[PDB]
Amino acid sequence: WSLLEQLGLAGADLAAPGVQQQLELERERLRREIRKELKLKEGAENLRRATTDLGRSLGPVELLLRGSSRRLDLLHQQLQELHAHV
Amino acid sequence: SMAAIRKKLVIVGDVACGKTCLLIVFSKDQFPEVYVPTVFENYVADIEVDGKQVELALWDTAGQEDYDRLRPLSYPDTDVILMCFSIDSPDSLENIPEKWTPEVKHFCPNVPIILVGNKKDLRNDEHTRRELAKMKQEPVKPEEGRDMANRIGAFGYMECSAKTKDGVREVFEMATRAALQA
Ligand SMILES: Nc1nc2c(ncn2[C@@H]2O[C@H](COP(=O)(O)OP(=O)(O)OP(O)(O)=S)[C@@H](O)[C@H]2O)c(=O)[nH]1
Ligand SMILES: [Mg+2]
């Protein structure tokens, strides 16, 4: 799961200038990912409500909503992991 | 793109009045498959109200009297309180001014409070009617919850069902707006 492990920075000197810049970039990316996921979720809730009024199955939408919250979770764990090395 | 505004939310209320399911249904879009009495848990939710992005910290507390000692330590930097009771339990509504309000006001005076009526789906539940009938009772009315809200000087009063997800977003958007005025 570790974003540091994913980036091959596992046991690197994280205080170095290059690494510190790469991490700031990653934090920015993550922040943008979270915001996008947040809006997709709010939109998905609107769809869930729209589907409720159409009288159709909410299963697909509920699954997307869960996948979206699950993604937000991962994004928060990684963002948290990088806040420790700023 | 700047970081989200941070605000911490604490939820309180009687045993099994639906506090955890409300937090999980909102933040994970999942209705907890098994009931597990809470001592203390915390989750993060993401929300946007009035064009403002907010990262909401959800602090889950215990309804049980057994853990009263722990609860006061969860109050310190709270931006908004979700004080709950269940619509299928008039006794849980009576504990609002009896136990929850006095405790919250003492540890968090000035902190916005949203009175929440949980399990709205049980109001018309026939089984709930027959059980409450025995105890010479009936499910909580919208007016009664709204009255109690006025009595404790709550920011607002909201009803919802974590089960059907009805009124869940409304509860959290109102709680966030209140926490923002801070
Ligand atoms: N019908 C219905 N049942 C609900 C709803 N929300 C929760 N419940 C049920 O009520 C019981 C208690 O819910 P839960 O959210 O765990 O309570 P709690 O207030 O967090 O309980 P505690 O930790 O203070 S002891 C559970 O069995 C749960 O499934 C709802 O909206 N409708
Ligand atoms: Mg709980």
Q: Is the CB of B168 under 6 A from ligand 1?
A: no
Q: Count Cβ atoms below 10 Å from residue A19 Cβ, excluding itself.
A: 16
Closest CA to B87 of B26, B132, B20: B132
Q: What is the resolution of this structure in A?
A: 2.2
CA B29, B33, B38, B42: dihedral to nearest 10 degrees? Answer: -30
Cα gap B70→B103, rounded to integer Å: 13
- Total domains in the fold of chain A: 1
Give the DSSP letter of residue B72. G
Q: Is the CB of B18 under 6 A from ligand 1?
A: yes
For residue A15, give the CATH number of its domain.
1.10.287.160
Residue A66 to residue B29, Cβ atoms within 8 A:
yes
Domains defined for chain B, CATH in brackets: 1-182 (3.40.50.300)
Cα gap B27→B172, rounded to integer Å: 10
CB B145 within 8 A of CB B93: yes
Q: What are the tokens at B12?
A: 């309180």
Cα gap A54→B92, rounded to integer Å: 36
Question: What determination technique applies here?
Answer: X-ray
Q: Answer whether A71 touches B (CB < 8 Å).
A: no
Pairing verdict, β B40-49 and B52-61: antiparallel
How far does residue B64's CA lie from ligand 2's centre (Å)?
9
Beta bridge partners of B159: B117
CB-based contacts of A56: which residues, under 8 Å, 6+ apart?
A: none
CB B87 within 8 A of CB B117: yes
CA-nearest residue, atom 7 of ligand 1: B18
> Quick one: which atom of ligand 1 is closest to the CA of B161?
31
Residues of B in contact with A41 (CB under 8 A): 29, 46
CA atoms within 13 A on the CB side of B173: 11
Residue A1 sits in which domain range?
1-86
The residue with tokens 């009595």 is: B151
